[PDB]
Amino acid sequence: PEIKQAVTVRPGMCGPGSLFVGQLGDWTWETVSAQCDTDVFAARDASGNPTYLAFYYFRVRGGRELHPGSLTFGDRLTVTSGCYDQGTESVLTLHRIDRAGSDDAQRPLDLHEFYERPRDGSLYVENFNRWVTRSAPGSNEDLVKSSPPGFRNDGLPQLPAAYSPRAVYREARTAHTFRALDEPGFRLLPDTVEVEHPVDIVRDVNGVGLLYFASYFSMVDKAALALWRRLGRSDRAFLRRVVVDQQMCYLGNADLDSVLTLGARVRVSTETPGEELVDVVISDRDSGRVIAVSTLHTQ
Amino acid sequence: PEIKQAVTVRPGMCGPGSLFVGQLGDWTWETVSAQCDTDVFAARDASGNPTYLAFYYFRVRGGRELHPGSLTFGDRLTVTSGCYDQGTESVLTLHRIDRAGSDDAQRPLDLHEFYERPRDGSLYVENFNRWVTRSAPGSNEDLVKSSPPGFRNDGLPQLPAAYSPRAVYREARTAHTFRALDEPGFRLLPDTVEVEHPVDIVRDVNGVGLLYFASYFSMVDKAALALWRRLGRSDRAFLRRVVVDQQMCYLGNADLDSVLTLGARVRVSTETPGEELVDVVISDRDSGRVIAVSTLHTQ
Structure with a gap:
């Protein structure tokens, strides 16, 4: 089940800074938490080491009719979010943002729309994430791939081979x-x-x-x-x-x-x-x- | 009616930066919106000029047992928020933050606690806000006091004279x-x-x-x-x-x-x-x- 929510634009999620991107990232952690049966915010590996659902690939695509710079205080949005299977150690999360009460804002996520035919007036977000852990405490380098034991990808819809954040990343x-x-x-x-x-x-x-x-x-x-x-x-x-x-x-x-x-x-x-x-x-x-x-x- | 919510700490609301303060400010705009019968995010004066519920006084008081630096990803909080009457053009919003399931986290807001006997292990937030509007478009200076016509203070609890964000401000x-x-x-x-x-x-x-x-x-x-x-x-x-x-x-x-x-x-x-x-x-x-x-x- 995809997650829809009504969103009013707050000062904490717009402007020329990175507040919007931060909010998107937060929604990704929330979406994964609800769809992959794991509390992303407090995730740990079996040894008790905190594991973070780190961002690897991040795309925000809009257009003249709607881009991040269009967003201002009080604007009413509808946000549609869902996760996609990237296997056992990583996950792709999509977010579509439409102005509330725009034409067909209720539509579900459409991979073809996201990857091949994006519409003007909608904002499309891809977050490809991978679980990681620190190799040494107080080191931000030589991070090691992980996944919290709770992590479940089995519920998730598949991407066809053509749509590959990983290939885009590489x-x-x-x-x-x-x-x-x-x-x-x-x-x-x-x-x-x-x-x-x-x-x-x-x-x-x-x-x-x-x-x-x-x-x-x-x-x-x-x-x-x-x-x-x-x-x-x-x-x-x-x-x-x-x-x-x-x-x-x-x-x-x-x-x-x-x-x-x-x-x-x-x-x-x-x-x-x-x-x-x-x-x-x-x-x-x-x-x-x-x-x-x-x-x-x-x- | 005071607003209670359960909150999980997200990357977008903690750390050595100002993300926590931003989130507090957002909750203030939401709290005022619900208690003063006005959409704060999209507020306008009678002539159609956007009016902003600008921050004038901001206090965050904690202690060794709980301060903003204590907050990390996944921590479970309970947040209790309510507005207080400062008249017709301004408003005081309080937020108390306790770790979830701590002793007596369910208690309502207590002015005496906030202003005279703050407890260790709780975080106390005061936001004194005042409605303002730009004097000229594309000027951030010579701001003029306002208030959106919808704005209602009549529902709100009073502060005694002793507790005065305004006097502290001055x-x-x-x-x-x-x-x-x-x-x-x-x-x-x-x-x-x-x-x-x-x-x-x-x-x-x-x-x-x-x-x-x-x-x-x-x-x-x-x-x-x-x-x-x-x-x-x-x-x-x-x-x-x-x-x-x-x-x-x-x-x-x-x-x-x-x-x-x-x-x-x-x-x-x-x-x-x-x-x-x-x-x-x-x-x-x-x-x-x-x-x-x-x-x-x-x-």
Whole structure:
């Protein structure tokens, strides 16, 4: 049974920050908890080690008629959430968001809609998650795959082979973009930024001492803003930008003394003005690790 | 009727950041919405201008047995919330947080408990809010007091004269601390910091373009961390610190191009080691305005 809920937009789940993404992540943990017979929030492996349903792949796709920037205080939404079988150690959670009382907001989740024919006026969320545990206490590195003994995938609907967050994940990890560089209709600009980001111990850190999944979105916007300003564009214009699609791949976490590097580049459309693809890579230079890859489709 | 709810701690409402404070603020808007016959999230004045239930005074008081830093993923809480009459244009909202199934977690709100005899193992939240509207669109300054025509205080319990968030607010605004400097048992250190903080347009901004009330808490921690490091203390120690009491006074908002100044000083106890009072003032130098005052009681 899919989970539907009526949602009023709160200050704690919108704006130019990562509050919306945080709320999405919370709903994913709640949805998995209800569908996979496990309390995700308090999950532990057999030895009593906390295990976290870490984010590996995260997509938010909207459009001009509805994107995360459209959302403001008091807006009435309907949210439809359901989990999909990715086996015994991981799980895919989908969320569809429609304005309440829009045409056909009651419809159930439709994989074809999500993966092949997304509609304008609906917002589509994919979270691919995998259970992990710390290898050493007070280390955010060398995380080990796990799964709490309670975890049940047996109830869940299947994905066809064609729809594969895992394959999408693997490709971004290789190409450092979610949109292949030989995609026609785009020219890669020469201007790029490389920004040092010391881990912000007040703003980047979650309640168990890991880098917070939502904060990677903030780090990515930090990189996109540096590039935005280097191109001589304004702060007010940055806050106006429409992100119709964003994909995020998490490769690792990082200890709280880390200095991360945020690399950003941009492709502009040769066919529609003001359409751009921004690619952001988060690196932990001293460990030789890429820890995140993101692509923003803006209009 | 007071509102009780069972709450499981989510990543979106804990950690060293301001996620908990954001969630508290959201619950305040929900509580007022249910008790004052007005949709706070979508409130408008008679002319159709959005009006916001802005935060003016914010206190979170706990203790060693339970403080915001105690809260971790999966913890089960019971939250008791109710509004109190502050007249026709403003409102006080209280939240008490107990661990679920703790002794007497079912008890109703008790003003005496909140204002005179707080118990260890319970967390006490005061939010004093006032309806405001923008004087000009795209200005965060010269805000004008308002109240949506729907707004009803007539149902609400009264505070006695002795309990006055307003008087507490007014004193901090004058003294730039919530704990009088002639309070015995404390020595003021000579070391102080003054930190420039350009408004962070990805992290400090809410969904209607105002500086986000929760982000002032982040700005205050930014100032406290600078002072913490200037005293030669470690990042890991900062994340261990126990904040048993924090008060925040909001005097104003600020336009998104503003450069704010974060001033911080500290008093150490002469009687208990590792007990400190940190005072933080947020200034907008170019407009000559103090926009926030905070005092942190740490142990």
